Design a protein around this nucleic acid. Structure first.
Lengths: 104, 74, 82, 96, 302, 93, 94, 105, 78, 96
DNA sequence: ATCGGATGTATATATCTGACACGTGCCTGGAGACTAGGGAGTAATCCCCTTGGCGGTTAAAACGCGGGGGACAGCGCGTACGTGCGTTTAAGCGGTGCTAGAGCTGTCTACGACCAATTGAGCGGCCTCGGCACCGGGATTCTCGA
DNA sequence: TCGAGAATCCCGGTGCCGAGGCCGCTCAATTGGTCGTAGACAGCTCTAGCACCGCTTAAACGCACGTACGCGCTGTCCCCCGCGTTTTAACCGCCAAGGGGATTACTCCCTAGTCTCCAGGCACGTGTCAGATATATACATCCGAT
């Protein structure tokens, strides 16, 4: 037997996404294509954010991504900043920023 | 026959009745004249709480009587 | 019994916070308003937290209900399983 | 003797504290404060540790964002020091 | 051991103060009560103030001798006043009500003697007296009377037939029992009149208490922390009160901008006016039973 | 008892962009809450689409016009491209 | 088709707080959508109490702790009072 | 047959609220007590807003409520303003308000 | 195209809020903020149009679109 | 002849436009602008009347609120006239 | 501007520990084949409603000019705040006792989906009449130049 | 200090079109039962929250002390309001052609539901190195005499 994930060429668990979608009263029915599409969208977004985080991680000479690198990666990229505009990432700190008029 | 019902403001209201009328239909007549719902009203005479399910002749209420009406809330 | 624990937020603590923000210099009449703002914020969120607590008869607050009640106000927060 | 000009030590504090990612307010008074306001809303709750740490994280987020907004607010008036008028002007725009 | 004695002006039991003086709080001790007692009695009796003028003095409240000396001078002056009353001088008129300063002093004295280890202040009660003027028809009850000092002040300031206090909690009711006895004792010591009163233990929500509340003309109730269940039951019990009765409370039972309509018919507001009491130079509210308002509303619907 | 995470799929999809890098135990839960938040918001704008047009089955077309509503622009375009390729392999075999 | 609304009930409840007023059409539809918005927000904070405590029936217990979450204080206390006095009358049916 | 409204002594239509809840997909089940409480809350809120609106209508010497009066009624009352803090009432205008420092000296 | 929103118009809209004096540079920024606002709302509106196989917007679709940017609207149904 | 001290007629018109209810921008060019900006998302749409009037109402109230906030922040810096950095500050605080 | 002293900041070096990847045994949720059945896809129709265009008032929009009030640069002052040093204080870290209460399984029972028939409660459609929109005459308000 | 005129408010008659009352009318609320699983509840194991305590030391704290700086003031000039006159197009009413919005049968084909089979994700335990800590030292930076 071949998993639904492999047929779609995705890494995220299609089956689990199907189960979560049916239970929760979002709709009476769930079409065949819906969980695949949603899984693929989640995959692309996770890879994008993790990709930038990993790139951010290297410059500090560390091989393990800790929260600071994750925080730095999202806010320095213009498009991602709007999606999490009302989100606070725990143990994140803020971006380095000193108002020009304050320098000696 | 006529009786009087004296409320607590100085106003006296009147009605023509017979002793065989029920207290409810007297209350309905008062509701017709003043608009006050029956269930909010409390008629009192000679210190005894006048019950609804008796007749007018049960309380010996005669012609030319002074009856007291206090208003209560639900 | 307990009294007046609002003075545990110290003056150098609020100065360090405002350093994280990015001011240079703070004047001697900010500490009262700052303590007041922290009090009204904690009042709102903690009240909604105990409401979500006592809804389902668990007499102790868990972290997940605090995450839910923070998401009610539109100040959502990851990092704890919410 | 040796001394700094007033102002640059604060900027050293800016360049240091921005890099570090640790909590700022010491924990025990914060836990005391949560227990007091919880006492005022109901009798005798109990708290797990993770909720207290989460509340502290969100509280520091709220305060740091409001402070940066006040700094922009105070820069708007040719002054470089915050004032209660500045924090109130920063407050009646967010909708409180 | 060492003892201090003050003779009563009417020949009642002497006031006794133990040495060392018992500590009341950080800013209150028995010497303070003693000095204010002497000052207020001198206020009560001009002759005594005269006598006490000749030999004001630097009282050292630390030294027993100095206090015993002033107490001796006072007791001798009390002796001389009793001789004066044996002569031609009219003695002090008995069983008159005390002045305001005296009522604060007596209540302070009973308080300091009773709370050895929240309370409404004297001043708010006094404001309340000033504004709700009681007559000999009125009957007053503090439901949840605390340590009972409101009941005592009204009992000492007005001529109602009887006052009652009811307290649920054992400790303050216990102190109120001592307050009652100490008040009656000091009152005998000063020779001043108050009306009769009794402070009883019980639960004012019982069936029995319904007729008592019903026949009470003035209710005071500090209901701020009661909660909706107790408040609800109180609304129901106020709804049986007689015409012209008044209720003063710290949280309104009806909103200040109340308007009778056909939807709000069961709110207590339909049978009462509400006005907010003037602040004293927290807030309390007076409700007065006036049923003519409902009658008016019905006449206007026709 | 057991509780589903989104741990091992984030940990698997890390390998296809970096061979070297590692993740921490707090960080994995942070990413877990991130994907869970995107899940509930996208399904919310999904289910609100039904009653605004009286349909009763959430489908591919439904969620596709949902995704262009939520993310701002460029990431949404990349999303809809990955989706419109991603339907093809499910109807391939 | 028979397009539903919330008009006539707003009309009936208006007459019980004022003896005689009028309400115009634009504001009547304003009241319509206001009722619709309060309904959808309360039902949302209701249905989120399903999956936050692993039960699947919205009960009469649920909407109470829903409504004291959303509105502020004085309105909340009068809301919960009106609600419990409503539900205690429904059970005494003949 | 007696309507659910009369048994509960309420004016808002209990039955319709029950129907909307079942088809709104909020939960698998809806208890018997659930629809009455919500209706009562909605009724009380309607009465509150209409009461203040009618008073505002009265002050301008008009007997017919138009939208401006509805807008004016919520914002002068402290408590209602928070519920509709992110709501704009169409054809409403704003509250009379001139900043003190702008008045002529 | 944008120049229908004229100078006394934006002055009037500013009068509603309660300024007294305006200086000679506000007009470009006002036109810009109106442009960005209308661009966002129209894009969301025509997306809710394009989904359900119609070709014309409607008031219900405009207000559904304006729900999700936090500025909800009464008075037109829905 | 006869004149007025400058600004006072503006104060009377503050009262006048605060009293009345009507719309502000004249309708037909507003319809023109909403037809042009709708061109770049799908060509050849057609618009109903009620949606146009509703968009007018919402854009009205949005511009009202933005001007009121920028007047208040302008007052904050002891200057009694708006300037472009004031509308930028009140926009940049809010969260755009 | 100029070097020079001094104090913090950054780079490579040992070590040392506790969080991080991996293998295993394991169950339980995911996959395949199959019915049955209704929600959804498509064709017709009809008609509301949208768009396009034309003539007239005219209300509003553009434009120049005079001038006044406020935007804005500089100057002096004193007040309040940063910085640093010696003193106090309670914050934090470990270790233990305990126990109220978080959480899980079992039983069953009251309560809530489901269905046939009933019917009045609620809604489209049509008259009608009165609140209020408009208008012009006077009765009050406001602001400013002397 | 105070009158002349521009605006603003009280009054009354006229004229209407949207409120609202009534009526015929359908289909959603109601009654009355059958039946079943979600929940209420009683009883257990065990965990993590709480309270206390002995003890370093980092951090809270109080005070001298100098100085950048918030604030008032004057002064200049510039740019913006008011108002009169002139050019634009907003708009109100009018007409007429047709584009798709709303709807109604019709079916068909996608999807809940079910049964069996079974292999992917989870708790657990195990090894092993990444990064925290310490440290000597190379060097950027800041004031200071000149």
């Amino acid at each position: 037997a071949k998993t639904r994930s492999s047929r779609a060429g995705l890494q995220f668990p299609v089956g689990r996404v199907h189960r979560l979608l049916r239970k929760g009263n979002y709709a009476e029915r769930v079409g065949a294509g819906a969980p695949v599409y949603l899984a693929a969208v989640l995959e692309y977004l996770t890879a994008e954010i993790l990709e930038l985080a990993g790139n951010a991680a290297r410059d500090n000479k560390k091989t393990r991504i800790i929260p600071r690198h994750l925080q730095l990666a999202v806010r320095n990229d213009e498009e991602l900043n709007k999606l999490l505009g009302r989100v606070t990432i725990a143990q994140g700190g803020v971006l380095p920023n000193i108002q020009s008029v304050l320098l000696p | 026959m006529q009786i009087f019902v004296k409320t607590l403001t100085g106003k006296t209201i009147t009605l023509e009745v017979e002793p065989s009328d029920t207290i409810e239909n007297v209350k309905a007549k008062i509701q017709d004249k003043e608009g006050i719902p029956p269930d909010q009203q409390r008629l009192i005479f000679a210190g005894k709480q006048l019950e609804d399910g008796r007749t007018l002749s049960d309380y010996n209420i005669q012609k030319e009587s002074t009856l007291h009406l206090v208003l209560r809330l639900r | 019994v307990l009294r007046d624990n609002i003075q545990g937020i110290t003056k150098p603590a609020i100065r360090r916070l405002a350093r994280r923000g990015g001011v240079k210099r703070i004047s001697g009449l900010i500490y009262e308003e700052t303590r007041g703002v922290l009090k009204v914020f904690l009042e709102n969120v903690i009240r909604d937290a105990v409401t979500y607590t006592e809804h389902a008869k668990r007499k102790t607050v868990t972290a997940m209900d605090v995450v839910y009640a923070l998401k009610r106000q539109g100040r959502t927060l990851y990092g704890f399983g919410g | 003797p040796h001394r700094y000009r007033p102002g640059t030590v604060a900027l050293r504090e800016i360049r240091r504290y921005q890099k570090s990612t640790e909590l700022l307010i010491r924990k025990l008074p914060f836990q005391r404060l949560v227990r007091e306001i919880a006492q005022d809303f109901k009798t005798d709750l109990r708290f797990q540790s993770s909720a207290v740490m989460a509340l502290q994280e969100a509280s520091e987020a709220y305060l740091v964002a409001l402070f940066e907004d006040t700094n922009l607010c105070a820069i708007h008036a040719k002054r470089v020091t915050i004032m209660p008028k500045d924090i109130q002007l920063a407050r009646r725009i967010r909708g409180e | 051991k060492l003892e201090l004695r003050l003779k009563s002006p009417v020949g009642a039991e002497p006031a006794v103060y133990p040495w060392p003086l018992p500590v009341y709080d950080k800013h209150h001790d028995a010497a303070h009560e003693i000095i204010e007692t002497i000052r207020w009695v001198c206020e009560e009796i001009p002759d005594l103030k005269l006598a006490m003028e000749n030999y004001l003095i630097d009282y050292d409240t630390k030294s027993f001798e100095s206090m015993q000396r002033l107490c001796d001078k006072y007791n001798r002056a009390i002796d001389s006043i009793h001789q004066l009353w044996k002569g031609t001088t009219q003695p002090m008129k008995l069983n008159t009500r005390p002045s305001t300063g005296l009522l604060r002093h007596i209540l302070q004295q009973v308080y300091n003697h009773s709370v050895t280890d929240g309370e409404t202040s004297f001043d708010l009660v006094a404001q309340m007296i000033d504004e709700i003027k009681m007559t000999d028809d009125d009957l007053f009850v503090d439901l949840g009377s605390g340590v009972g000092q409101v009941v005592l002040q009204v009992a000492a300031a007005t001529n109602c037939k009887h006052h009652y206090g009811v307290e649920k909690a054992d400790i303050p009711a216990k102190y109120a029992e001592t307050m009652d006895r100490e008040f009656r004792k000091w009152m005998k010591w000063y020779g001043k009149k108050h009306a009769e009163y009794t402070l009883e233990r019980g639960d004012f929500l019982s069936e029995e208490w319904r007729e008592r509340i019903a026949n009470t003309s003035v209710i005071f109730v500090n209901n701020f922390a009661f909660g909706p269940e107790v408040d609800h039951q109180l609304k129901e019990r106020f709804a049986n009160m007689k015409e012209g009765g008044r209720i003063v409370s710290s949280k309104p039972f009806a909103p200040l901008n109340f308007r009778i309509n056909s939807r709000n018919l069961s709110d207590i507001g339909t049978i009462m006016r509400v006005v907010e009491l003037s602040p004293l130079k927290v807030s309390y509210y007076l409700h007065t039973i006036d049923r003519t308002i409902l009658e008016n509303y019905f006449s206007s619907l026709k | 008892t057991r509780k589903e995470s989104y741990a091992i799929y984030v940990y698997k999809v890390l390998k296809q962009v970096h061979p070297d890098t590692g993740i921490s135990s707090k960080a994995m839960s942070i990413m877990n809450s991130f994907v869970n938040d995107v899940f509930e918001r996208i399904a919310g704008e999904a289910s609100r689409l039904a009653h605004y047009n009286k349909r009763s089955t959430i489908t591919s077309r439904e969620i596709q016009t949902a995704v262009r509503l939520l993310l701002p622009g460029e990431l949404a375009k990349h999303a809809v491209s990955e989706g419109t390729k991603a339907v093809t392999c499910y109807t391939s075999a």
